């Protein structure tokens, strides 16, 4: 069976100039019979290929900044950043090369910038008249510039909770203010759309003492 590589945490908020560390654990020993422990660490940025930073637990790749270091033994390993810089955001993977085939990787640890909690500004948008006369209704809820990333969006149509008929999308953390934005799209047939009156988007977020709701009534402005 594959060696299972388990990284934690799944997401790590970091503070510039402060240390960070992430954990990688293997399902069995990575000590090879030749005496080496083949455990590698990678950084990946969006749009870019993975870049190896550390190999055989603690050897640092050439050109890799010495604020990165690796340690551990057996089944338990650690990647440490002594003083986090802005370019250190992204996804980090571990990889074992002791047992193969196949080589196996952890499922990644996302590194992001920590900031103060910020509530989302919420906006709801009814479908356009143009879209409606094509037989489909898209209703859009926008959550603007919030932190942290975790947020719950619920669609209620005449107070009936929806599920299975919407999709979300989230922006990468903003490089200047370190917030996220999120869009949720409710999709209905023109027929189903006209069978109801009240369309509402309910937002739960740490920055909101109680869930915020934005709504409209179909056919009224």
């Amino acid at each position: 069976a594959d060696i299972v590589m388990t990284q934690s945490p799944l997401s790590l908020p970091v503070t510039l100039g402060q240390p960070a560390s992430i954990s990688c654990r293997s399902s069995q020993s990575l000590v090879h019979s030749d005496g080496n422990t083949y455990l590698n660490w990678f950084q990946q940025r969006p749009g870019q290929s993975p870049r190896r930073l550390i190999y055989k637990v603690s050897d640092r790749d050439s050109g890799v900044p010495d604020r990165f270091s690796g340690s551990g033994s057996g089944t338990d390993f650690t990647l440490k950043i002594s003083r986090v810089e802005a370019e250190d955001v992204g996804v980090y993977y571990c990889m074992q090369g002791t047992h193969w085939p196949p080589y196996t990787f952890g499922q990644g640890t996302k590194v992001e910038i920590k900031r103060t909690v910020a509530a989302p500004s919420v906006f709801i948008f009814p479908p356009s008249d143009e879209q409606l006369k094509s037989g489909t209704a898209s209703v859009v809820c926008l959550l603007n510039n919030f932190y942290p990333r975790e947020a719950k969006v619920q669609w209620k149509v005449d107070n009936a909770l929806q599920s299975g008929n919407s999709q979300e999308s989230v922006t990468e953390q903003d490089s200047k203010d370190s917030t996220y934005s999120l869009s949720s799209t409710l999709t209905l047939s023109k027929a189903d759309y006209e069978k109801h009156k009240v369309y509402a988007c309910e937002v739960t977020h740490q920055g909101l003492s109680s869930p915020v709701t934005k709504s409209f009534n179909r056919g009224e402005c």
């Binding site: 290929s49 993977y93 990889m95 934005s181």
Partner: protein, 220 residues
């Protein structure tokens, strides 16, 4: 320093065979394995297989039945073929230099997934090329454009031909059940300017030669 150059078709349909290739420049073609690795949308890394200059291979057992990896030493090139593709095979694929191919060099030399090509985004879909429809998201106020039902990625969105950039959020596309993509681009603007400022989203989708400018204004 080893460099890798990667090419091959990334858009394909179910049941067809994926065919990617890489070429090696800058160092010897011998002494290490040459490997393929993939990364499914929003998920981790999966090692697929490898081959060395002499043609010895190792394959991931979960894919062995559909994977063939070959080498062509006279050009210093190696190739991957993945047959009967389905949506599950959708991923970014990379070729990469693996470990040394002999024990003593494997023990002492730094090699091991240390050089990676640029990734090829692979999509597996039955969809045909289609330009997007562009709908307004009518209005600190917020407004935007809904860019719906297009294939394949990508589209680009600008606002007022580039003159408006501050406060713009253009979301990642979601792939809908129809197999077509959809996205929204939004911008926050001062409410006091709504009646005296014009907002237009400029939408380009190259495969379909779609160029749409949609003006977005308050309703009735």
């Amino acid at each position: 320093q080893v460099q890798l150059q990667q090419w091959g078709a990334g858009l394909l349909k179910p049941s067809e065979t994926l065919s990617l290739n890489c070429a090696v420049y800058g160092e010897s073609f011998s002494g290490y394995y040459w490997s393929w690795i993939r990364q499914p949308p929003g998920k981790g890394l999966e090692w697929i297989g490898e081959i060395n200059h002499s043609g010895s291979t190792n394959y991931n057992p979960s894919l062995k039945s559909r994977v063939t990896i070959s080498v062509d030493t006279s050009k210093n090139q190696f190739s991957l073929k993945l047959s009967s593709v389905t949506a599950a095979d959708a991923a970014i694929y990379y070729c990469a230099r693996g470990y040394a191919d002999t024990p003593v060099f494997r023990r002492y030399y730094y090699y091991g997934m240390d050089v990676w090509a640029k990734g090829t985004t692979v999509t597996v879909s039955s969809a045909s090329t289609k330009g997007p429809s562009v709908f307004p998201l009518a209005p600190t106020a917020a407004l935007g454009c809904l860019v719906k039902d297009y294939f394949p990625e990508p589209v680009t969105v600008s606002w007022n031909s580039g003159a408006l950039t501050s406060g713009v959020h253009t979301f990642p596309a979601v792939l809908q059940s129809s197999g077509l993509y959809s996205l929204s681009s939004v911008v926050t603007v001062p409410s006091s300017s709504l009646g005296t400022q014009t907002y237009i989203c400029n939408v380009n989708h190259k495969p379909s030669n779609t160029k749409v400018d949609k003006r977005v204004e308050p309703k009735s």
